[PDB]
Every structure is written in C-alpha cells, then in structure tokens.
Amino acid sequence: KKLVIKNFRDRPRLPDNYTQDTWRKLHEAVRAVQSSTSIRYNLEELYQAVENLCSHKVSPMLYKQLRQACEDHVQAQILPFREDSLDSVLFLKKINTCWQDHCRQMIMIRSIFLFLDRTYVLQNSTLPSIWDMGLELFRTHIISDKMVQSKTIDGILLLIERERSGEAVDRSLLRSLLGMLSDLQVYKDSFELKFLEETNCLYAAEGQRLMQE
C-alpha cells in the first residue's frame, strides 16, 4: 500500500562537496597506508565515509578507483628489483619484505573498505575481494612477467641445494617466500617442476657417486 510524504521540503541540499572531499580523504588514507605513512583521519570515520559513499551506481566507480590506486603503487614497486646489485639473498629478503608489507597494507585497506568488499564486490563472482585483487596485482607485475621470477626461483633452489649439503639457509626466509608463491598460486608451477626436476637429478648422481664410494 503506497505512501507519499506531505511537504517533502527536499531542501537540506544546495551546495555540494561532501563527496570529492571524501574521495580525497580516501586517496590520502590509502597513499599513506601504502608508502608506510600515518594517516590522520582515524579509521572508523574513514569506514563510515565508505559505507555512506558506498551506494549502488557509485560503489562500482569506487572499486575501480581503489583498484587503480594499488595498480599504480605496485607497478612502482617493480623498478628497484629491476636492478643488478647481485647477491641472490639480498634480492630475496628484499622481495620478502616487499611482500610482508604489501600484505599488511592490503589488510589495512580491506578493513577500511570492509563495506565495499562485503557489499558490492562480494555480490559479484566477477569481482575479486580487495584481498584477492591485490594478490592478482602483486602477481602480474612482480613475481611474474619478470626476470624476478627466474631470479627468485633460481635463487630459492640455490638456498636449498646449499642446505642439502652443509650450509644453513634461514628457514623462515623460504617458508615465507614459498608460502607467498603458494598464496599467489604460482607454486605448483613456477617452482614445483624445477624443484623436482632438479631433485630427481641431484639424487640421481648421489646414487652412483655413493654406490661406488
């Protein structure tokens, strides 16, 4: 049974800025979660800013914005790795911290945009969680489509190959890098074969060498 509001003034709105000035408070909050800065809008307000800003027809343009924000920040994270200061162990701890962080800083974001993830993005098989969406970005540029792959891989084995014979190698650094590879869905594919193909080889040798020896 329909209903209409008598004298719906439709007046408490003349100017207008409490939008692009909120999209501003968000860019900042982000660029300052990324690039390890501290923001000064303290979380909940930023959260409510989304929940209100986050209404159909707009949520969609917001997502694109939050995405491309990172899309930009990660592509930037590449450059350094695209260097040549060769100690396939620095390169590693490098890439690990470069991960350990993107992690906690996509977790920060998610919490701020919780409402956009568990409302719009969640109502869409099409669209990946903010989380999953960062993993997809950290993949495309960094661990992927780069010398970085074959520089991280050829470097992970190296650490092992050298533990399979009398050195140490810092378990953690690998448990992390390999975990990553897993979390990123490139383990059983950008690391597995080689690993095996390199084991079902090394031990092949040990056989003879040690039978006769």
Partner 1 sequence: MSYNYVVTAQKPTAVNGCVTGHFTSAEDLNLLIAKNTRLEIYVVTAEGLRPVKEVGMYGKIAVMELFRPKGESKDLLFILTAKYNACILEYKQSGESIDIITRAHGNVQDRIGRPSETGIIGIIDPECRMIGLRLYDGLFKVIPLDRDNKELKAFNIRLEELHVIDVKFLYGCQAPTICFVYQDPQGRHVKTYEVSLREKEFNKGPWKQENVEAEASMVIAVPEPFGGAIIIGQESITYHNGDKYLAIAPPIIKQSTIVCHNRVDPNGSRYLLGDMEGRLFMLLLEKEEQMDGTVTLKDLRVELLGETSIAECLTYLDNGVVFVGSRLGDSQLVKLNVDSNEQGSYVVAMETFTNLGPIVDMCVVDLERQGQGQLVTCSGAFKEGSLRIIRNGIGIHEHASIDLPGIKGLWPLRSDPNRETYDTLVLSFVGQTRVLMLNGEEVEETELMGFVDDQQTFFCGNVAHQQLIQITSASVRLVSQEPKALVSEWKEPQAKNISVASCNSSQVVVAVGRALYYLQIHPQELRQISHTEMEHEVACLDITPLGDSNGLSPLCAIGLWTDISARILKLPSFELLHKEMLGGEIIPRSILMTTFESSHYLLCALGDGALFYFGLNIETGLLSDRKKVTLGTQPTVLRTFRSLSTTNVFACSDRPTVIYSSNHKLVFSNVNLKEVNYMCPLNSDGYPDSLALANNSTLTIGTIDEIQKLHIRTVPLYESPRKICYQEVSQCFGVLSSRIEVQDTSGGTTALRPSASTQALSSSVSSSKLFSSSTAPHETSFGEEVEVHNLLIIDQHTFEVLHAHQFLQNEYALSLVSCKLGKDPNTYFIVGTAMVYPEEAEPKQGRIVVFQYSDGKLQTVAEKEVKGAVYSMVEFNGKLLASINSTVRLYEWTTEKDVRTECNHYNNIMALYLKTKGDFILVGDLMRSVLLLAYKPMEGNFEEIARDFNPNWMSAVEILDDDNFLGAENAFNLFVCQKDSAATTDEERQHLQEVGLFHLGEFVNVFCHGSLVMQNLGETSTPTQGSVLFGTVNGMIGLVTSLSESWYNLLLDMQNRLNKVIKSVGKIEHSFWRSFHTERKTEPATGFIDGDLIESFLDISRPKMQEVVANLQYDDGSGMKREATADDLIKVVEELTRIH
Binding footprint of partner 1 on the chain (CB under 8 A): 1-9, 12-13, 18, 42-45, 48, 52, 55-56, 107, 110-111, 114-115, 118-119, 122-123, 125, 132, 185, 188
Task: With CA atoms as reference, report the closest residue to 33 among 130, 141, 120, 129.
Answer: 130
Of 56 and 209, which CB lies nearer to partner 1 in the complex structure?
Answer: 56
Q: Which is nearer to partner 1, 173 or 184 (CB)?
A: 184
Give the nearest distance from C-beta 23 to partner 1 in angstroms: 14
Beta carbon nearer to partner 1, 81 or 105 = 105
Rounded CA separation 198/15 (Å): 68
Helix axes 192-212, 149-161, angle to 10 degrees: 30
- Using the minimum distance from each CB to partner 1, give the nearer residue, 118 or 175: 118
Question: Hey, CA dihedral for 109, 114, 116, 117, is it positive or negative?
Answer: positive
Q: Which is nearer to partner 1, 4 or 61 (CB)?
A: 4
**Least distance (Å) from partner 1 to the CB of residue 41?**
10
When computed from its CA atoms, the radius of gyration of the chain, rounded to whole angstroms, is 24
CB 12 to partner 1: min, Å: 4
Residues with Cβ within 8 Å of 121's Cβ and at least 6 positions away in sequence, in order, are 63, 127, 128, 129, 130, 133
Of the pair 104, 171, the CB lying nearest partner 1 is at 104
Q: How far is the CB of 38 from partner 1 (least distance, A)?
A: 13
CA torsion 125-177-95-202 (nearest 10°) is -130
Q: How far is the CB of 4 from partner 1 (least distance, A)?
A: 7
Q: Which of 135, 107, 130 minimizes the C-alpha distance to 120?
A: 130
Q: How far is the CB of 43 from partner 1 (least distance, A)?
A: 5
> Hey, what are 94's tokens?
């490098």
